[PDB]
Amino acid sequence: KILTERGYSFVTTAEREIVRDIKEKLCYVALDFENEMATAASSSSLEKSYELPDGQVITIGNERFRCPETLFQPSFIGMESAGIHETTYNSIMKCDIDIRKDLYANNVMSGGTTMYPGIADRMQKEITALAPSTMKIKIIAPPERKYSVWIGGSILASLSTFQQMWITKQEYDEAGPSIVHRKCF
Amino acid sequence: XXXXXXXXXXXXXXXXXXXXXYXXXXXXXXXXXXXXXXXXXXXXXXXXXXXXXXXXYXXXXXXXXXXXXX
């Protein structure tokens, strides 16, 4: 619904997945939205040239950076939840008072969206908006985030305690799926 | 006894009467060097062709302008 502005336009599932590549290649995070618009008026370095997976060269403006902002502003497909960062600080302010500093220190992100360069920075900008500036803030942005989960799962698998913890066939014999919801989180 | 007016006129006449020789000589000989031009009929063809195909007609606008959108 953006792309039809330039109006090279195709809708089906595979066509939609073609975008995924562009999401790999062409995206980057807005540092500042207004200022970016000012650069958008100034410059074309913001604009890059990319091929169809086969067929044409395609070249894309602000349409790249505008995309991630949805995370910060889910108007563009429109909802209210005040966004990643405001959700986060909200959910903090739910949680209790003393712990908070640790989380201000320990802030962690992973997987599909996070791949984009720059998210952590504007996130920090946002928290510096919302935090009392007085206290330390940082975020973690590991390289491997998209794999992170399965990696952690491997660790999770390693420790013998799950031998205490696994479900066994026997229970499934002796009681239903109901077992899980007590037994697991 | 002779070769004569009578015979010479015979030959003359026969010459005149033979359609095959004179007609073939003019028509068949002139048939071979018949044609050289960049025909205007083909100019029409070319022009029509120019008008013919979407690959020129649509693309001239759409590739050119939808380049710059915003």
Q: Which two tokens stand for residue A36?
A: 């970016």
Exposure string of A40-65, with b = 16+ CB inside 10 Å and e = fewer, is beeeeebeeeeeeeeeeeebbbbbbb
> CB A7 to CB B69 under 8 A?
yes
Chain B partners within 8 Å of A59 (Cβ): 67
DSSP H helices in chain A:
13-25, 33-42, 63-72, 84-94, 100-105, 111-114, 119-130, 145-158, 161-165, 169-174, 178-183
B66 part of contact set with chain A, CB < 8 Å: yes
B1 part of contact set with chain A, CB < 8 Å: no
By C-alpha distance, which of A66, A11, A61 is closest to B69?
A61
* Residue A159 CB-half CA count within 13 A: 8
Q: Which two tokens stand for residue A160?
A: 């013998």
Read off the CATH number of the domain in which A74 is found: 3.90.640.10
Method: cryo-EM
Domain range enclosing A48: 1-84
Residue A136 phi, psi dihedral angles, 5° rounding: -50, 145
Chain B partners within 8 Å of A7 (Cβ): 66, 69
Catalogue the E-assigned strands of chain A. Answer: 48-51, 57-60
By C-alpha distance, which of A99, A115, A120, A108 is closest to A152?
A108
Interatomic CA distance for residues A5 and A8, integer angstroms: 8
A67 CB neighbour count, 10 Å cutoff: 20
SS3 A51: strand
Interatomic CA distance for residues A92 and A98, integer angstroms: 11
Q: Do B62 and A8 contact (CB within 8 A), yes or no?
A: no
Residues 45-84 (A) with a CB less than 8 A from some CB of B: 59, 61-62
SS3 A56: coil
| Nearest-Cα residue of chain A relative to residue B66 | A6
CA distance B54 to chain A (A): 17
Which residues have a Cβ under 8 Å from the Cβ of A23 and sit 6 or more positions away?
Answer: A67
Per the document, the length of chain B is 70
